[PDB]
Structures are given as structure tokens and as C-alpha cells.
Amino acid sequence: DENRNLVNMQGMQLTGYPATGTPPTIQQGANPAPITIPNTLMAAKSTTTA
Amino acid sequence: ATAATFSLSFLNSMQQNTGANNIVATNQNGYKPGDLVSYQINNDGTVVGN
């Protein structure tokens, strides 16, 4: 749609398991929420383990 | 707002090598407020408002 949500042909939002964390992963028991595909850019990340 | 104290129960769990870890059931009895959408009469005899 106009503000990046997966929406069917009439104006309702497809929902799923929300992704959180740094780095983001999927929590297999959370309460569902709409999905947004963001256009923001990835911030950098320092090295911790080689 | 006044914070609460609630009892959390991990009852009826298992550990029996079922592949990997996944939650199967979560529930509680708290809810945001709301107003009356619709009343209906079921066939057993009750009247229920959603």
C-alpha cells in the first residue's frame, strides 16, 4: 500500500510473527502484528567475533 | 497506573526429544476495554454479546 504494508485487494493487513532483535530473528510465540517492508537503510555493525 | 502481581504457571510441560523447542500454548485473562458490537442468541439458550 502507500505506506509499505502487505495488504490484499480491499484494504486489510496480512499479519504474522513480528521480527525483533539486533540481528533480527523470529520469535515463535509472540502475539501477531502487521508486516512492514521498511525502506530505511541498514546501520553498520562493529566486529565482535572472528 | 497501578502495577499488578500475577501468577505464572509452566504446568503440563514436557521434555522428551521432540526435535527442537517451540511454544504450544499461552494464555492470560487480561484485556483492553471496548464497547458492545453485537448481541446474538445461541441455540442452547444463552444470549451473548460480542
Partner: protein, 50 residues
Amino acid sequence: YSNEQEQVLGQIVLANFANNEGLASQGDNVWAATQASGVALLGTAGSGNF
């Protein structure tokens, strides 16, 4: 309007009732509220009982 702009001019209200089947007709395809029909109970078309 002609400058990449939107304005509002109003919003139509709807009117529920505590009780239908008590409204009377007075000629044209309209209904007049009566006693044993209730107060007006105006509202918006989006959510709630409407």
C-alpha cells in the same frame, strides 16, 4: 484541488436506535422517531455499533 492538495468538507453521521419496528412512516420514504423507539443516538460510520 489543483495544487496537489486534499481538503475535507464534512463527514456524514449515522443514527442508530435502541429499538427498530417502532418507527412510523409519514408518506415519503422516511421515518419519524417516536416514543417506544428511543433517543437519536448519533455516531460515526466507522466503528462501534454502526
